[PDB]
Design an enzyme around this catalytic site. Structure first.
Site, PDB file in Angstrom:
ATOM      1  N   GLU C 157       0.903  -1.236  -0.078  1.00  0.00           N
ATOM      2  CA  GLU C 157      -0.071  -0.001  -0.187  1.00  0.00           C
ATOM      3  C   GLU C 157       0.912   1.311   0.136  1.00  0.00           C
ATOM      4  O   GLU C 157       1.979   1.222   0.384  1.00  0.00           O
ATOM      5  CB  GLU C 157      -0.809   0.069   1.447  1.00  0.00           C
ATOM      6  CG  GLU C 157      -0.340  -0.111   2.592  1.00  0.00           C
ATOM      7  CD  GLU C 157       0.492   0.870   3.435  1.00  0.00           C
ATOM      8  OE1 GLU C 157      -0.185   2.121   2.649  1.00  0.00           O
ATOM      9  OE2 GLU C 157       0.998   1.044   3.937  1.00  0.00           O
ATOM     10  N   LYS C 216       8.804  -0.734  -0.901  1.00  0.00           N
ATOM     11  CA  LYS C 216       8.122  -0.267   0.126  1.00  0.00           C
ATOM     12  C   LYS C 216       8.665   0.366   1.306  1.00  0.00           C
ATOM     13  O   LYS C 216       8.504   1.640   1.967  1.00  0.00           O
ATOM     14  CB  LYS C 216       6.979  -1.266   0.660  1.00  0.00           C
ATOM     15  CG  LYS C 216       6.021  -0.956   1.659  1.00  0.00           C
ATOM     16  CD  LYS C 216       5.359   0.401   1.270  1.00  0.00           C
ATOM     17  CE  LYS C 216       4.657   1.068   2.412  1.00  0.00           C
ATOM     18  NZ  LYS C 216       3.926   2.343   2.004  1.00  0.00           N
ATOM     19  N   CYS C 272       5.083   4.931  10.474  1.00  0.00           N
ATOM     20  CA  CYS C 272       5.443   4.257   9.214  1.00  0.00           C
ATOM     21  C   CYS C 272       7.117   4.577   8.925  1.00  0.00           C
ATOM     22  O   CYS C 272       7.966   3.814   8.511  1.00  0.00           O
ATOM     23  CB  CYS C 272       4.708   4.427   7.953  1.00  0.00           C
ATOM     24  SG  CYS C 272       2.967   4.053   8.236  1.00  0.00           S
TER      25      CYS C 272
END
Ligand code: NA
Lengths: 462, 459, 456
Positions: C157, C216, C272
């Site tokens: 994502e 990612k 994150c």
């Protein structure tokens, strides 16, 4: 030129207390009012028993208490009436946050600066009397400028103390020098001469030094560091004497007879104590680290590291002599104060020697003629004290069945003890560890009795 | 010259116990009295159930218990004996200067002060336990300070070398008998007196006479040389896993050199026992105290390599299990520090378990001889209750387990039914052989479905 | 070849992503499952998370092709594509504590998928996983293989907490990674055809599984590196007299560098940035790449230096003593227009001031009152922390005002009223450069204002 007639001193400790008593005693035309936030202190000064015991202090206090020397808890009225305001509040070392264990805490000075500027109008002189960090007077000026009122002209000066615990009155009546620091401005010079004129009532003008505010703050810290450096230097020599066969008392005498070096503060010991030396050196180191001066910081840090090395080395000699096992062994600890002729145990080397022996599981029997029994239990705590620590009422009870006798304080009575009787009830081999060089001259006698005596700065024989 | 007729030994604990029984068994004319402050031990020696279980010990004790072998009156035994053994344990200090490395001499301090109290005349004092170097100087210092008129106490060193399992055999036919004494005419008389006791059953060639300091140092150094051989071959095992070589093949090629020997070259997850790490760490502490840091960090490498060997083995298990062992069932086969024993002192299984317990794993431990209560104590400081389960058999530990870990070279682990184990193991099923006991079953276990990894072999 | 008609998503990240899929693919059945019953019942009620435009998307398909259920076994058996959108938290124990990721929630899904599945199905990891994790999933499938059982893909994502719906309808790019085998290419094109219902083919990148997992992590490291870089310059601006906003603008006008993520601040937050950078460093140490590890560690060390340096400036301006001093902390979330306080820089600035014995009065318009007390705990919170219900109440008798979150409302406050009831001297520490343009006004009022990246 302004003349000072009424003086207020915030803080009735050993700093502002004795200093203001001498001012009222040598300046009868000046009204001196000592104030403090502690009500118990004020009642102690007004009682026939003062909270601090300095020689010749009772004669000075009772000669002025009532005429021009007054003690009260009404700080606001004393600030409003006084022309000169002393700030004699304690600035303890921070025990938390940025600078823990080294930096000084300015919360008690911050409160006075905000309370002075509150209950004051007109022209008044604010003088920091306590040991403050450098550039702290800039903080006091910053509070005054931010909280400025119409017709408010507060002058900030530095006038640190230099008296020692024991000769306060003698050091105040005949001081080596009086330090006054202020801004290099016409307004600052007027305030300097005002305070300088107060000391000229009994201090010659030659012994009055006028510097800037920052030179006055830095001189107070550096003076205690220079003194502390002399003790650590002679202690480092003592470790070298123990390895070469030299004697530290002989080397200190040969060094001390140089007039450029002097013979004061050259007595080797288990380590210097007191609430001023380590406090001011560690603050000086923190200041240099904050100012991106790491070379200067690690220079003065050696004074503390040497003092810690001196204590740990002395405790290691005791443990090594006791076959590296002190579990359930009785050890007599003679002397607990950081020096003789006092009951103060702040940063005393006896605390660290005791804790080093307590880490081996030793049974310590501590004796000190003046230190109270409750102070020893507090200084040795964070449970552990109850198992290993016993406080004796006399030296012989502490040496009844003990493996070694450790002298950590230079009390004169320890020199005159009956070591023939002590050796009879000590386990063999019986050791004496002289951490203050008080038995210098009794080595041949103590060895013939049966003692193996070891001391700082002398190589062990055989 | 002087002849020894009455012997006293302070401490009846695995060291002085078996040694004095053999002396009484080979010297019927010498009265040997073993004393101890603990009455429970003495009554155990005089009972048909001895406190320690050594093969052939009952035969030696029952032959002399009554004639010249006697077991709590320490004061009278010291006064009557010509030779006094000090066989008290000297544990590692857990406090103060030297914590975890230095030895505590408090149990020797008491014996030296109690000997000089209940003694007059000429007597020989010999230290039998594992003591630090220069400890005899401490005993001499107490004797010199507490000297009496007409008192001549001689101090000797005579360390033990027996192993837990073959104590009696190592005493009847020892590789060597070490006796250390002062290099003085009085000291040599006491040395020959103690030498004459062992000449009743030990050849004179296998009796070495050195100074007091060489005898204390030899005992510590002998265990360090043995431990260094295991750490050296373990360092090679880590190198074999990276080159494709095999450590058992390299150890064989090294062992066939007559100058090196083939003993103590078995690679493992790490050596255990209460003697190897204790004596090496004490040797390192001795060097630091004598301003010999080069020697200290030299011998410290024996410990670091052993700790590296254990931690490396535990990391292989975690990495093979996808670096997550939370709530995973792992079978731990073997808990003693070696096979054919129940001793778990400094056992490598303790550290491998704690390494896996720090990952939140469900360990199912099995050992045929280690008691159930010993495992729970060694795994404590809460944490043991949530993660530790002790199985009575291997298959119960491998019922739904992700991997099988072999930490002790028990012979029974070689003969297990791995076909049944794999059926009730979660997939993929791993086998980590930390002792090279499955050498020869690699092809069989892989065809069953196991991924087998072992010390000193590339995967 | 194969076409996907029924979707299962383990974990309700996966919620908004699958709602958009069901909204743009009316012929595809999307079923979001989770082991937590509290989340599933919240989705079926009039939602547990607040994203703009999410209620319109859910209600437009909740019932037709979008369903929320706790029955995970039935959804796995029926679905053609199974998303793995379970959280992989940082390990707090054992080997890799504080850096490595814990794969226990992925291990459980892989063992539960291979259990309740037969035939051909596509398994796609949707969450942020460590590199070579797909190798572990393939090993579990191969070990627990059934007859006639056959694919593992990576599709990470890239949505941000606040603009999820806009980033899902018009994504910058769609990343899909798979094995370099004919079977893997079939599964990639199968997953590609799902996004082609509303995403062009140019914005769909197909790489291998390992390049997709690493991309990612690296993308969040590159973004974090830009903030630490402009923060290191901000410390240099404060020492040279330069201004970081002027330098960041001059740098940003270079087309090769770009002007995004160049706003200096007290430090980046969120669950994150630091999480993926610290995991990236641990990966390099595990692969014997210490030079690469200590390279990316500087992004974290600089971020910690930025926070500690700002907290030290506040204490030094306050005469190096903050004991029993009232300090107003305006802003607690890691950024504006949110209530998330995960790894927020306001937590560390507060704890640094709490270690000095300060009385902090914290205010945040969206952060809940109970969350602030939890983030400041492990008794110390009760003595030093006070939560204000509105501003001005935090500045009533306060020595300094600290702005830790770039809330737009803090720019429009009445600083004339604040100064009247503040103790003097009154300080303002702008840790987000929101007061750029009010410096001359605040100084005439009486404030001594300091900010990140400007010499005092
Ligand atoms: Na800080």
């Amino acid at each position: 030129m302004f003349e000072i007639k009424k003086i207020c001193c915030i803080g009735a400790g050993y700093v502002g207390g004795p200093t203001c008593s001498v001012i009222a005693h040598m300046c009868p035309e000046i009204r001196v009012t000592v104030v403090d936030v502690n009500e118990s202190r004020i009642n102690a000064w007004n009682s026939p028993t003062l909270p601090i015991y300095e020689p010749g202090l009772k004669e000075v206090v009772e000669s002025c208490r009532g005429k021009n020397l007054f003690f009260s808890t009404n700080i606001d009225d004393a600030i409003k009436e006084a022309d000169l305001v002393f700030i004699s509040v304690n600035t303890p070392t921070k025990t938390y946050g940025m600078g823990k264990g080294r930096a000084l805490d300015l919360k008690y000075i911050e409160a006075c600066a905000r309370r002075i500027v509150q209950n004051s109008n007109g022209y008044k002189i604010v003088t920091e009397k306590s040991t403050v960090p450098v550039r702290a007077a800039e903080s006091i000026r910053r509070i005054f400028d931010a909280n400025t009122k119409p017709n408010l002209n507060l002058q900030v000066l530095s006038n640190p103390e230099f008296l020692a615990e024991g000769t306060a009155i003698k050091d105040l009546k005949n001081p080596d020098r009086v330090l006054i620091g202020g801004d290099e401005t016409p307004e600052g010079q007027r305030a300097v001469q005002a305070l300088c004129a107060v000391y000229e009532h009994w201090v010659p003008r030659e012994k009055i030094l006028t510097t800037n505010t920052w030179s006055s703050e830095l001189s107070k810290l550096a003076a205690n560091a220079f003194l502390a450096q002399r003790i650590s230097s002679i202690n480092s020599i003592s470790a070298l004497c123990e390895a070469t066969g030299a004697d530290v008392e002989e080397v200190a005498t040969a060094i001390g007879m140089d007039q450029r070096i002097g013979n004061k503060f050259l007595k080797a010991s288990v380590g210097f104590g007191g609430s001023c030396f380590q406090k001011d050196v560690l603050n000086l180191v923190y200041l240099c680290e904050a100012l991106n001066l790491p070379e200067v910081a690690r220079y003065w840090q050696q004074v503390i590291d040497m003092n810690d090395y001196q204590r740990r080395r002395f405790a290691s000699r005791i443990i090594d002599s006791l076959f590296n096992t002190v579990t359930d062994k009785k050890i007599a600890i003679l002397g607990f104060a950081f020096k003789k002729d006092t009951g103060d145990t702040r940063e005393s080397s006896s605390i660290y020697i005791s804790k080093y022996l307590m880490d081996e599981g030793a049974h310590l029997h501590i004796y000190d003629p003046k230190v109270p029994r409750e102070q020893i239990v507090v200084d040795l705590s964070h449970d552990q004290v109850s198992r290993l620590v016993t406080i004796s009422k006399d030296p012989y009870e502490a040496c009844d069945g003990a493996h070694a006798v450790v002298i950590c304080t230079e009390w004169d009575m320890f020199k005159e003890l009956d070591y023939e009787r002590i050796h009879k009830k000590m386990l063999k081999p019986a050791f004496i560890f002289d951490g203050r060089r008080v038995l210098d001259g009794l080595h041949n006698e103590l060895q013939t009795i049966g003692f193996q005596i070891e001391t700082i700065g002398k190589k062990v024989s055989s």
